[PDB]
């Protein structure tokens, strides 16, 4: 039910693109050069994961987009985007992935 999106300007424009809609996700889906949005907003769980090599524009776009998802998908009004750096992932985030190590 969760979806994972890439937020990157590496392809020439700033783009939010779906990378996973089958659960659980591959840990290797998270690429250090970009940011990712993990959307499980129906229960208020939305994450921005910031790759260590992503750029400032990607971080800002990922946070803006994750915030806009709350509004546009009618997620609960008190939902807070959880922002995590590569290497600082929490159990709540890792639970979405297969065999995180
Ligand atoms: Ca990038």
mmCIF file of C-alpha atoms and ligand atoms in Angstrom:
data_model
loop_
_atom_site.group_PDB
_atom_site.id
_atom_site.type_symbol
_atom_site.label_atom_id
_atom_site.label_comp_id
_atom_site.label_asym_id
_atom_site.label_seq_id
_atom_site.Cartn_x
_atom_site.Cartn_y
_atom_site.Cartn_z
ATOM 1 C CA UNK A 1 0.000 0.000 0.000
ATOM 2 C CA UNK A 2 2.902 2.442 0.513
ATOM 3 C CA UNK A 3 4.545 4.017 -2.542
ATOM 4 C CA UNK A 4 8.141 5.196 -2.982
ATOM 5 C CA UNK A 5 9.021 8.140 -5.200
ATOM 6 C CA UNK A 6 12.341 9.521 -6.402
ATOM 7 C CA UNK A 7 12.885 13.303 -6.284
ATOM 8 C CA UNK A 8 15.736 14.238 -8.589
ATOM 9 C CA UNK A 9 16.871 16.835 -11.060
ATOM 10 C CA UNK A 10 19.485 14.434 -12.465
ATOM 11 C CA UNK A 11 17.472 13.871 -15.678
ATOM 12 C CA UNK A 12 17.388 17.563 -16.566
ATOM 13 C CA UNK A 13 14.316 18.872 -14.773
ATOM 14 C CA UNK A 14 13.168 18.518 -11.189
ATOM 15 C CA UNK A 15 11.014 15.386 -11.298
ATOM 16 C CA UNK A 16 9.022 13.325 -8.796
ATOM 17 C CA UNK A 17 8.699 9.838 -10.215
ATOM 18 C CA UNK A 18 7.288 6.572 -8.889
ATOM 19 C CA UNK A 19 9.966 3.945 -8.216
ATOM 20 C CA UNK A 20 8.096 1.349 -6.147
ATOM 21 C CA UNK A 21 4.506 0.297 -5.611
ATOM 22 C CA UNK A 22 5.116 -3.287 -4.384
ATOM 23 C CA UNK A 23 5.686 -3.750 -0.654
ATOM 24 C CA UNK A 24 8.007 -4.327 1.056
ATOM 25 C CA UNK A 25 10.553 -2.141 -0.775
ATOM 26 C CA UNK A 26 14.128 -2.994 -1.705
ATOM 27 C CA UNK A 27 16.666 -1.249 0.518
ATOM 28 C CA UNK A 28 18.705 -0.653 -2.641
ATOM 29 C CA UNK A 29 15.881 1.476 -4.073
ATOM 30 C CA UNK A 30 17.262 4.364 -1.976
ATOM 31 C CA UNK A 31 20.000 5.913 -4.091
ATOM 32 C CA UNK A 32 22.449 8.261 -2.403
ATOM 33 C CA UNK A 33 22.467 10.736 -5.290
ATOM 34 C CA UNK A 34 18.757 11.707 -4.908
ATOM 35 C CA UNK A 35 15.970 12.197 -2.390
ATOM 36 C CA UNK A 36 13.014 9.865 -1.974
ATOM 37 C CA UNK A 37 9.473 10.218 -0.634
ATOM 38 C CA UNK A 38 7.947 7.245 1.115
ATOM 39 C CA UNK A 39 4.215 7.855 1.082
ATOM 40 C CA UNK A 40 2.043 5.933 3.519
ATOM 41 C CA UNK A 41 -0.029 9.045 4.140
ATOM 42 C CA UNK A 42 -3.407 7.346 4.729
ATOM 43 C CA UNK A 43 -2.248 6.650 8.268
ATOM 44 C CA UNK A 44 -0.198 9.800 8.548
ATOM 45 C CA UNK A 45 3.194 8.257 7.693
ATOM 46 C CA UNK A 46 5.136 10.243 5.039
ATOM 47 C CA UNK A 47 8.936 10.310 4.946
ATOM 48 C CA UNK A 48 11.550 12.259 3.043
ATOM 49 C CA UNK A 49 14.826 10.319 2.783
ATOM 50 C CA UNK A 50 17.776 12.564 1.850
ATOM 51 C CA UNK A 51 20.579 10.817 -0.015
ATOM 52 C CA UNK A 52 23.998 11.999 1.133
ATOM 53 C CA UNK A 53 24.876 13.109 -2.428
ATOM 54 C CA UNK A 54 21.534 14.746 -3.229
ATOM 55 C CA UNK A 55 21.609 18.494 -3.860
ATOM 56 C CA UNK A 56 19.915 21.396 -2.086
ATOM 57 C CA UNK A 57 17.267 21.786 -4.795
ATOM 58 C CA UNK A 58 16.308 18.105 -4.469
ATOM 59 C CA UNK A 59 16.014 18.303 -0.652
ATOM 60 C CA UNK A 60 13.828 21.392 -0.894
ATOM 61 C CA UNK A 61 11.692 19.902 -3.667
ATOM 62 C CA UNK A 62 11.261 16.650 -1.751
ATOM 63 C CA UNK A 63 10.032 18.424 1.360
ATOM 64 C CA UNK A 64 7.708 20.697 -0.647
ATOM 65 C CA UNK A 65 6.270 17.750 -2.556
ATOM 66 C CA UNK A 66 5.753 15.565 0.520
ATOM 67 C CA UNK A 67 3.940 18.490 2.161
ATOM 68 C CA UNK A 68 1.815 19.024 -0.936
ATOM 69 C CA UNK A 69 0.857 15.308 -0.924
ATOM 70 C CA UNK A 70 -0.874 15.832 2.433
ATOM 71 C CA UNK A 71 -3.091 18.502 0.882
ATOM 72 C CA UNK A 72 -3.640 16.971 -2.524
ATOM 73 C CA UNK A 73 -4.251 13.366 -1.384
ATOM 74 C CA UNK A 74 -6.416 14.429 1.616
ATOM 75 C CA UNK A 75 -4.164 12.766 4.161
ATOM 76 C CA UNK A 76 -4.945 13.550 7.809
ATOM 77 C CA UNK A 77 -4.616 17.271 8.394
ATOM 78 C CA UNK A 78 -2.146 16.876 11.294
ATOM 79 C CA UNK A 79 0.275 14.641 9.284
ATOM 80 C CA UNK A 80 3.883 15.687 9.721
ATOM 81 C CA UNK A 81 6.514 14.799 7.152
ATOM 82 C CA UNK A 82 9.321 12.814 8.768
ATOM 83 C CA UNK A 83 12.664 13.895 7.305
ATOM 84 C CA UNK A 84 15.506 11.428 7.546
ATOM 85 C CA UNK A 85 19.107 11.562 6.266
ATOM 86 C CA UNK A 86 20.801 8.585 4.661
ATOM 87 C CA UNK A 87 22.282 6.607 7.592
ATOM 88 C CA UNK A 88 19.861 8.095 10.154
ATOM 89 C CA UNK A 89 16.836 5.971 9.299
ATOM 90 C CA UNK A 90 14.444 5.057 12.087
ATOM 91 C CA UNK A 91 12.758 1.690 12.692
ATOM 92 C CA UNK A 92 9.422 3.119 11.513
ATOM 93 C CA UNK A 93 11.018 3.838 8.142
ATOM 94 C CA UNK A 94 13.063 0.634 7.879
ATOM 95 C CA UNK A 95 9.925 -1.455 8.479
ATOM 96 C CA UNK A 96 8.810 -0.577 4.957
ATOM 97 C CA UNK A 97 11.800 -2.421 3.447
ATOM 98 C CA UNK A 98 12.680 -6.101 3.041
ATOM 99 C CA UNK A 99 15.457 -7.331 5.367
ATOM 100 C CA UNK A 100 17.008 -3.927 6.088
ATOM 101 C CA UNK A 101 20.644 -4.290 7.112
HETATM 102 CA CA1 LIG B 1 20.661 14.167 -7.549
#
